[PDB]
Amino acid sequence: MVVSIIPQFPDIKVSLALFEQVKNAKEIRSKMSELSTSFAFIDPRLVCSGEQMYSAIYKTLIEVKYNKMRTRNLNSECVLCLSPTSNISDAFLKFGIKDDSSQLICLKFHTNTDDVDKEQLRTIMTSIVKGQEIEFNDDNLSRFYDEALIRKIYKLSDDFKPQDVNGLSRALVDAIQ
């Protein structure tokens, strides 16, 4: 897993873990709203890069710090900011894990943590998720995204013709920012 801190928001830490060969996506999805106070579970088919996720996390803390929290918690707020929609139920429907998900991103905002307990967190995540943790990095995210779904959901122009994941990513960061 990765623990990420934005310089201009020094008291917030976000942990990101990536899981593959996930077996219990259905069970997790059924408890998604209840689980949101502890984790967001995001469908990697919609996420092509780390910078996409970091851009969403930044946008989240900006909206919350310099505006208003629209949802019940930061984990959910981040899913809302990752998505083009203004409605959280729509964001969960599109970006949350699906019954048929075989990979997932597990995200958690820590506000009160002075120093994240990485072994405890990993233990809890793996108690909830039945799958194999792999590194949260661009090499792995590049494997699991679905350009078609991404194009449709972020409303990318058919004219828009990226040459690689870097180009696609850059356009998503733009949509998000």
Swiss-Prot record:
Protein name, entry field: EKC/KEOPS complex subunit CGI121
GO MF annotation, one: tRNA binding
Compartments (UniProt record): Nucleus; Chromosome, Telomere
Signal peptide: none
Task performed by this protein: Component of the EKC/KEOPS complex that is required for the formation of a threonylcarbamoyl group on adenosine at position 37 (t(6)A37) in tRNAs that read codons beginning with adenine. The complex is probably involved in the transfer of the threonylcarbamoyl moiety of threonylcarbamoyl-AMP (TC-AMP) to the N6 group of A37. CGI121 acts as an allosteric effector that regulates the t(6)A activity of the complex. The EKC/KEOPS complex also promotes both telomere uncapping and telomere elongation. The complex is required for efficient recruitment of transcriptional coactivators.
Keyword tRNA processing: yes
Keyword Transcription regulation in record: yes
Assembly and oligomerization: Component of the EKC/KEOPS complex composed of at least BUD32, CGI121, GON7, KAE1 and PCC1; the whole complex dimerizes.
Gene this chain is encoded by: CGI121
The organism's taxonomic lineage, starting at the top: Eukaryota, Fungi, Dikarya, Ascomycota, Saccharomycotina
UniProtKB keywords: Activator, Chromosome, Nucleus, Telomere, Transcription, Transcription regulation, tRNA processing
Protein family according to the UniProt entry: Belongs to the CGI121/TPRKB family.
InterPro entries from the UniProt entry: CGI121/TPRKB, CGI121/TPRKB_sf
Gene Ontology biological process terms from the UniProt entry: DNA recombination; maintenance of translational fidelity; positive regulation of transcription by RNA polymerase II; telomere maintenance; telomere maintenance via recombination; tRNA threonylcarbamoyladenosine modification
UniProt-listed Gene3D superfamilies: CGI121/TPRKB
Domain of life: Eukaryota
Any Pfam family: CGI-121
A GO cellular component entry from the record: cytosol
